[PDB]
Amino acid sequence: GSELSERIESFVETLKRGGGPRSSEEMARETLGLLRQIITDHRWSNAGELMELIRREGRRMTAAQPSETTVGNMVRRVLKIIREEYGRLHGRQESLHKLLTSDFSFHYAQLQSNIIEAINELLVELEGTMENIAAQALEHIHSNEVIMTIGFSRTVEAFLKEAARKRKFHVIVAECAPFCQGHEMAVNLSKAGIETTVMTDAAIFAVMSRVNKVIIGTKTILANGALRAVTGTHTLALAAKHHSTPLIVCAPMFKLSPQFPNEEDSFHKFVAPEEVLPFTEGDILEKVSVHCPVFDYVPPELITLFISNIGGNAPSYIYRLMSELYHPDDHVL
Amino acid sequence: PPPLQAVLVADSFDRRFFPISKDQPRVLLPLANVALIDYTLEFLTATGVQETFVFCCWKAAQIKEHLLKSKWCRPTSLNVVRIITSELYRSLGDVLRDVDAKALVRSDFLLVYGDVISNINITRALEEHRLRRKLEKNVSVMTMIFKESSPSHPTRCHEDNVVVAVDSTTNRVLHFQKTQGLRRFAFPLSLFQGSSDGVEVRYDLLDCHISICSPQVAQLFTDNFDYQTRDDFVRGLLVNEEILGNQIHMHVTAKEYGARVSNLHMYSAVCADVIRRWVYPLTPEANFTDSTTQSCTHSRHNIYRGPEVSLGHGSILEENVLLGSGTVIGSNCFITNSVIGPGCHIGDNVVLDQTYLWQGVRVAAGAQIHQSLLCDNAEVKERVTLKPRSVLTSQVVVGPNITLPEGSVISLHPPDAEEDEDDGEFS
């Protein structure tokens, strides 16, 4: 009750004010733990009340920070898990087959235990996601290869550190200005023994002619295979497409969102202009419009491969993955 | 560490907002459809303050009613807000003397006015202050917060400009003065007698009006009954360096924002900065106050649109525009760099530039308003042109076929309003 309410309020305020969990996996774990706490603590008779309350909590969580899709992704995953559990315990996708062939009020005592067990299994699968993704590094990196990365991605870092145990290759890291987080990635990879280069975004095209493949992370994967990545990733994808350089996205399955690129102006995250133009400029700040978008939209035609904890896939298959994770009625939430 | 407290002064004892502040207190003035005290409370809550005492004297009834209806008075708010009211308050020194008398603060509280807009985290400043208190045996008493700025910025009003002389290696304040109408700044040589090195004269500091104080600050305020303002305390403490040193230090931030809305120029500058997202995450679309009437959506060129706006055909919102819920805009209009409150009605073929419209304002067709300000439920008739730097207060109605002068302030109250008016400008 009070503990649950204060935990929810703290989570919402942390999302609204930023900071909190740097790791996306940590954010997913905290979201799942909070959802489990709501399921255990909150009182509900039938599954319909659970749907309504989880939907309200997820709506509040995503309204706190719409650019943080992992929270909504986990909320929809929990809703799908609850729906599947109810269908298994009570009963026995839209398609041409279903179209040709063709009630949550009922109550069950053991449904809650099954829901918690499924959520715990999901958490266990989430725990080993990074190792599962990194275990595929040797199948995609050959000897004396050149890899291009932008910003700081922990999944890509684990990928490269696992590949470096048996192969020698070069990694080029482009800083993601203004938050030049690529410097930390470069120094980490150098500490791991990999030979690394640090450069600004302005050189992304210039050196792309000498890059064998591009390995990047993302914040979100849309239903059509599009990316909500850090800013400057669209230019990197365009430069890779110019040279037909394969672009690999190493992203866990919990970053898949059933949304579509129809949404406008809430996609990119806009922050204080101080990052781009300092406050000490003076009077010219009065008449100059300064905008600092954090995220970028990447169309699916610029992506070659998705590597996740379940293996490799093409963007054209992303829809099927989206069909296996979320019910079509939970996209609106 | 003990819980972090904060003393909030909801009374501006100066009267730089007359005659606007006659009806509504300055602490409740809407900057971007949100009152200044809301921004101050949000800033205090975000920085880790757990206890916040508010002191209000002038029109304390409305302030208390607004506070009890706000988010921070909910039982779920981590920052507890207490309201202390007394009609005998005349200055900040009186408030601090009352604080000392009632022993409200135990150690290391935050002193700030009720009209500050900031996103500053004082955790590093608090750590430095506490470390120097522990090392130097509580000799230090106060650390001021300053923002690295430029003298040419709009937020650097001439009245509030301050030049400081500090010790570089330890961030100790040695001299402090204002630059109101002075082309020459003088510094006593005694500071150089204190140290042969480290003395630096800084003019690139914008006074955020945030301080980290100690109970000894309240004790000194009680000892010296002549201390009315914070400047009085700073000057009296710095001039008497020979006896009872009680050093004052400073902290400078370069990536965060901090400002105080002390006049109309400051109001315009801070409103522009907030609309342009300089106080992120405190943005109009963030809706940091959980109220349904202030929700909106953000769009390219900094366009903020609330629920049920229904913008007319042919009208253009160029950039930096905020629209409240229920506001109706006519056709073939031109709004730019303006904030419009909820429930406003705007005619057709009207050009608003750098104006600020509060809730209830109705504007007739064909008007031209530039760099003006309209208060609650103000009215404007047809064929009216407002020159820059014009103010209409509290349901003032301006008649048709008149061009107002530049610095024309109009209010229902006769004396303070430069042109008393009811339904026109010609008598």
Next chain:
Amino acid sequence: MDDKELIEYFKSQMKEDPDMASAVAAIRTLLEFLKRDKGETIQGLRANLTSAIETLCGVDSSVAVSSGGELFLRFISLASLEYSDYSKCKKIMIERGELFLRRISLSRNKIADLCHTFIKDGATILTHAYSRVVLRVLEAAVAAKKRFSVYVTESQPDLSGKKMAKALCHLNVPVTVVLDAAVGYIMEKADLVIVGAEGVVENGGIINKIGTNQMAVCAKAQNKPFYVVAESFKFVRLFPLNQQDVPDKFKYKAEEHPWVDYTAPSLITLLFTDLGVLTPSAVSDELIKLYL
């Protein structure tokens, strides 16, 4: 002479020889105006020629007429540079104009002779609308005893493609008429595209009937060579950045129905002019050589 008889001369000379192009008729009219001027100053001659070109371009809104007018103005300026005295300059300009008229008359046969070699036996040729130079090219090809098929588009605003099909059937060449929306459907059947031009812009692109750009884009998408036949007097120092950048005096009066569009040089394989077979990059050079 006078505006009324200037327009009358233009229209009558176009009428009496339906074969001669509009630009050739405009240049002939301007040369006749030069012949009977009764002036004594090269400044007044330049002003009067500019006014006559303005009137002629007001009579019809074709790019070729304006191109010919600019070429005539450059010719007058060059002749003035050569000879300072106006009395000596006038006769030289008259004879040079006569030679220029003969050359621009022979231009069509030169283009046909140079272009007929690029079409093979059994090739499928796609054209866009009526073009006299394309007709001459096909006549030269059939005179060379070559067998080929031709597709034309109806060119909806004025069914000049039907006129081209009739003129080709008059010589008994197998031709087909397809809709303006069938070009993308018919591109895979064809082997190369031959179109005319109403004017060649500075960067090597062309201005031509409203259907040319889509045909060029489809040919590029299906990797088909795109050939343009155009005379040299249709070279204009215009640089359209896009379709909207085309001057409006050439779109309309010649819901919204522009008469011409612009094709970028990257969509053009070769240009066949009286100067020879050129890459699109050559045209700019030509213009840069003409204006010092």
Next chain:
Amino acid sequence: QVPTRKDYGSKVSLFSHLPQYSRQNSLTQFMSIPSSVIHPAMVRLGLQYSQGLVSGSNARCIALLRALQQVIQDYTTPPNEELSRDLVNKLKPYMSFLTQCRPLSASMHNAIKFLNKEITSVGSSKREEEAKSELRAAIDRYVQEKIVLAAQAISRFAYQKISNGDVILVYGCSSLVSRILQEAWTEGRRFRVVVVDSRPWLEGRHTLRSLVHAGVPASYLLIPAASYVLPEVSKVLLGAHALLANGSVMSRVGTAQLALVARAHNVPVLVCCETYKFCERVQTDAFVSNELDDPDDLQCKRGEHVALANWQNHASLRLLNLVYDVTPPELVDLVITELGMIPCSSVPVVLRVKSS
């Protein structure tokens, strides 16, 4: 003689053929005071070259020509020798010293070629004072024609391509672009400008200030966000440091990035460049010929720590600070020169008509 400047730090293997220097290190510590081997004007010019006191292409060319005018004024021919050969041979060590301070730009290379051709053309029978006066006058005339009149002509040409209500995107700092926009605004065109900047030089801020002082509405952003703002952009106006014989545009790094992203958004790309910056050399990529700036400039203070501080302690870590990039001619729609509006493929043609 003049000692060889030491390369600073470890370079990327792909760029190991290029020199990489340190801004703090200067050649003047090992050189004599007063300057004897190198002319004092050349020493001062190299000092402000290596410290970055003058940076622009036209600014660098003008400063070089002013220092060369000082050298010609201070020059005296030796007995039994001719100015035409002695001056040419004497200028080479100064040019080598200047290149050691910082690699020469294309505009400076063309200026050196012009000055060497003009000095060679000086007859032996010509009097020394007359020859020096004619050399100084030729330098002044070169500056006039190739900079001022060229910029005015390019402004007049670009006025026809700027309409009311269009959005123009510019990158970094270019005096020609700023002049074009300022005169376009003055003549009566109404528009807005989008300014794109990149680390670590942040030269675009310069242009921003200019626009603010001219009354032109302006927007500011960094290069990674460029793809966000190109949907609302109508034309892209880019300055050039050099135009190559194959039509490629050698410019500040990130220019080809902007050209590619603008082509992805169906935005025409216009390049303005004076014909004296046209080069006969060809270049297909940014690796074979480029400049390596000081790597320590990449260090930035984020939060309270500098991640790239003491980056040389890591053996496998390298810092790359590219200066220039090359834009292929297929990404450029139009070049504006004092001769007019031309395609990129016409760049060699100009090189043919300017030479003879």
Next chain:
Amino acid sequence: MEFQAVVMAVLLPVGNKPLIWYPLNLLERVGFEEVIVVTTRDVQKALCAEFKMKMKPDIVCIPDDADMGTADSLRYIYPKLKTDVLVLSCDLITDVALHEVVDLFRAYDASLAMLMRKGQQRDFIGVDSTGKRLLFMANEADLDEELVIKGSILQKHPRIRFHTGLVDAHLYCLKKYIVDFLMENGSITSIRSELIPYLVRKQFSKSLDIYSFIKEANTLNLAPYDACWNACRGDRWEDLSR
């Protein structure tokens, strides 16, 4: 010829080597060939004869009047000056790499450059953030217990670092037009006390720039004999390298 060396003496060889030798030695190792010396004549105008036995590359000496000031002595040798002047004093005993000062005069096209050292009537020196440009200079005699700064200076430079105890090395790089101004206005008597503060004042009213390099290795032993031992105490340390 960007610099002409001028040594000021209006000295007694109090040390291991003659006091004049060390500034001359520094000027020789930095690259100077021709050096102009002004010899005292109040006691005896025979310092030229004494220095005629030296082994320096090239020396040019001029006897002075009975009593003259440093600005007056610069006025004495005006026909001998054709370019920017490097003014030194015979008491300078230091091992500065001269490029640390001359470069300040080179890169920024400075009107005047000077060298000062950290200390072991005090002089108040105010510099900018970079620590190179000199913005303010004062001595306690002129000011009545109040250090005064113009508002425009703080508008252009909003951060001024103040040094209270620093030692001036009296080593100056000066432009020609400074000496020309000294000609047009003969009121100034000493460069170190009036001329340089006047130029600092004129920096904020064609533009005037003044730069100073602050050093923390060694400095000149003061004219008073109290520090005259210290130079010797350091001389053996510097004799090995020099």
